Amino acid sequence: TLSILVAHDLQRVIGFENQLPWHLPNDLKHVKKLSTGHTLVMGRKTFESIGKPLPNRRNVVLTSDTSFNVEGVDVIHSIEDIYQLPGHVFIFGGQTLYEEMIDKVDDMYITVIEGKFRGDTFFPPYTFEDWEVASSVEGKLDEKNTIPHTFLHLIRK
Ligand SMILES: NC(=O)C1=CN([C@@H]2O[C@H](COP(=O)(O)OP(=O)(O)OC[C@H]3O[C@@H](n4cnc5c(N)ncnc54)[C@H](OP(=O)(O)O)[C@@H]3O)[C@@H](O)[C@H]2O)C=CC1
Ligand SMILES: COc1cc(Cc2cnc(N)nc2N)c2c(c1OC)O[C@H](C1CC1)C=C2
Numbered sequence: 001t002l003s004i005l006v007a008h009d010l011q012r013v014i015g016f017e018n019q020l021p022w023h024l025p026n027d028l029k030h031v032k033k034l035s036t037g038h039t040l041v042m043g044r045k046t047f048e049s050i051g052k053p054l055p056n057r058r059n060v061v062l063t064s065d066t067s068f069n070v071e072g073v074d075v076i077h078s079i080e081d082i083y084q085l086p087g088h089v090f091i092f093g094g095q096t097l098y099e100e101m102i103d104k105v106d107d108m109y110i111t112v113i114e115g116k117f118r119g120d121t122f123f124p125p126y127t128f129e130d131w132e133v134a135s136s137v138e139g140k141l142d143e144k145n146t147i148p149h150t151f152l153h154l155i156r157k
Contacts, residue, residue, distance in 0.1 A: 002082070005034060005090040006098060006123055007111035007149075013119030015094060018049050021117035026145045034109060038088045046093035047073070060085065062097065095121040102126065107155045111139070114148035132157045 007027050008014045015021065036056050044063035053059040053072045060074045062082075068075045076082065079100050082089065090109075091101045102108075102124050108131070110123075131154040139149035 001088045001107065002105050003088065003090050004098060004101065004105050004108040004110070005031060005092055006108065007113055008123040009113040009115050009117050009119070011116055011119075012123045012125065013117050013121070014098075014123050015121030016117065016119050018045060021119055022113055022115070022147055024111075024113065024145055024147055024149065026139050027111050027113075027149065030109075030111065030151060035090050035092070038090060039085055040090050040092040041076075041082050041085070041097070042092040043094050043097045044068075046097070049094075060089075095123070099124050105156070107134075107153065110152040110154065112150045112152060114150065128154075130157055131155070 006014060007020070007022075007024070009021065013021060035054070039058040039060060040054065041060045041062060044061055044065065047061045053070070058074065059072065060076055060082075061068070061070070062076050062079070064077055066077065091097050091105060134153045134155050135151070137151045139145065139151060141148065
């Protein structure tokens with residue numbers, strides 16, 4: 001499969017200043033569960049945000065810098081290179097990946113962060129007319145996960 005994996009807020013904010021706008025450990029645990037043993041493709045800037053490869057899956061960074069060679073990352077330099085990767089590939093961020101990728105992906109794992117944050121980066125507007133809810137499961141709140149949130153899984157209709 002080829003999937004978006006993204007958390008966005010009530011106005012589709014994903015990012016602020018090259019970071020997530022929220023602290024929400026449940027969602028990062030969700031990312032882990034979903035992606036472990038599989039492949040991430042991210043934009044260069046998102047890679048700079050996580051700063052190192054994530055363990056126990058394959059990490060692929062899309063970048064135009066051909067001098068890019070990082071330990072345990074695989075570089076690619078075009079959108080097209082994605083479509084040849086073996087297996088279940090998650091588009092992992094960021095704003096520009098999502099824009100390039102959203103009409104190409106089979107499905108999307110979105111966490112809707114039921115808040116309104118300040119962002120400088122956004123997820124593309126989409127329409128549920130295009131997208132079928134295979135599941136919708138509320139996140140559980142606790143002291144350390146204090147923002148309401150819903151795990152959507154959308155298949156393209
Ligand atoms: N909420 C969420 O689920 C997530 C949010 N984010 C957020 O997203 C924001 C980052 O978004 P954005 O600024 O768009 O950054 P991106 O992470 O999408 O990276 C952009 C970079 O990726 C490379 N790139 C993208 N497309 C291509 C292409 N087609 N060919 C060659 N290179 C390409 C370029 O690298 P180069 O300049 O080296 O050529 C470009 O500068 C941050 O705010 C971050 O916090 C990130 C992940 C998840
Ligand atoms: C933009 O920054 C991040 C993006 C992301 C990507 C990301 C986060 N949340 C969601 N829902 N989708 C995503 N694609 C993550 C993230 C980020 O900050 C560290 O943290 C952890 C990694 C191990 C450290 C997980 C994710």
